[PDB]
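Reagents: none. Just compute today. cRW3 cationic antimicrobial peptide.
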Amino acid sequence: RRWFWR
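Predicted 3D structure written out:
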C-alpha cells in the first residue's frame, strides 16, 4: 500500500 506493505 501507500508507503508500507502492499
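The chain is about 0% helix and 0% strand.
Action item: order primers for follow-up constructs.
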